[PDB]
Amino acid sequence: PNSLEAQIRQAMKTGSTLTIEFDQALNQKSPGTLNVFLHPANGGVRIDLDSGNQGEPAKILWLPWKQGELQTLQPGSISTVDMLFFTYYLSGCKVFAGDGGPVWHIDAPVEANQFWRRMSSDEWMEDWEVGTDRQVAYLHRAGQSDSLWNLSAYLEGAAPSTYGRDNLGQAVVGGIVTGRQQMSLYQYATTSSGSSAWSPLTYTLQQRKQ
């Protein structure tokens, strides 16, 4: 086969099943570029900081998870075509991505009004004038209380993407860099019944209401 990095990009683009196992230690690494090791794993790839065990070095874009709040990947970090992007598992978490803007990973318990207020301090948000449009990918867990995810007071457009059902399930989000400050996003989900294949995580047109 090709490199593990190539195998992940191919699985993403082909819509194949190839799971990702993240070492929890990655959450001690700040958002932005990160040198990791990829390893063979059962039905997928393990991403960690271990140089041994058939490890293949890769430089990725990384977005950690932090309990009770959000983390942000800035678009100025995004440069190298074909570089992979990952965030840590979504365990009831939300991910919001502006096309050409930041990516946010918001922990499950943070209320939508609270995390929107925190996001909105970002320069890209301050530049998003009321009554104007952006392309936005937004992913939340189906069956979670609306309080924790619903942005309909703020955004006009397509419904969010969802993972899971009945407030149960986990998701993986990653991406492939396509140019300066730009990525294509991909996702899969994990049920008590196993993991799905990769699929696109789509940007849709959203107008800022207020």
Author numbering: 2 to 211
In the authors' words:
Burkholderia pseudomallei lethal factor 1 (BLF1) exhibits site-specific glutamine deamidase activity against the eukaryotic RNA helicase, eIF4A, thereby blocking mammalian protein synthesis. A mechanistic similarity between catalysis by the cysteine proteases and the glutamine deamidase activity of BLF1 and CNF1 has previously been suggested given the similar orientation of a Cys-His dyad in their respective active sites.
The presence of one or more oxygen atoms bound to the sulfur of the cysteine side chain clearly has the potential to alter the local geometry and therefore complicates an understanding of the interactions between the residues of the catalytic Cys-His dyad and the substrate. Analysis of the refined structure indicated that the sulfur had not been subject to the oxidation of its side chain, but the position of the sulfur atom of the cysteine side chain was otherwise unchanged. In this reduced BLF1 WT structure, the Sγ of Cys94 is 3.12 Å from the Nε2 of His106, consistent with a hydrogen bond between them. Analysis of the geometry of the hydrogen bond donor/acceptor atoms of the two residues indicates that the hydrogen bond has a more linear arrangement (D-H--A˚) if the proton resides on the Nε2 of His106 (160°) rather than on the Sγ of Cys94 (144°). Thus, it is reasonable to deduce that His106 is protonated indicating the presence of a thiolate-imidazolium ion pair stabilized by hydrogen bonding and consistent with the “ion pair” proposal for the mechanism of papain. A further significant conformation change at the BLF1 active site between WT BLF1 and the C94S BLF1:eIF4A∆20 complex is an alteration to the torsion angle of the side chain at residue 94. In WT BLF1 the cysteine at this position adopts a gauche+ conformation, whereas the conformation of Ser94 in the mutant is gauche–.
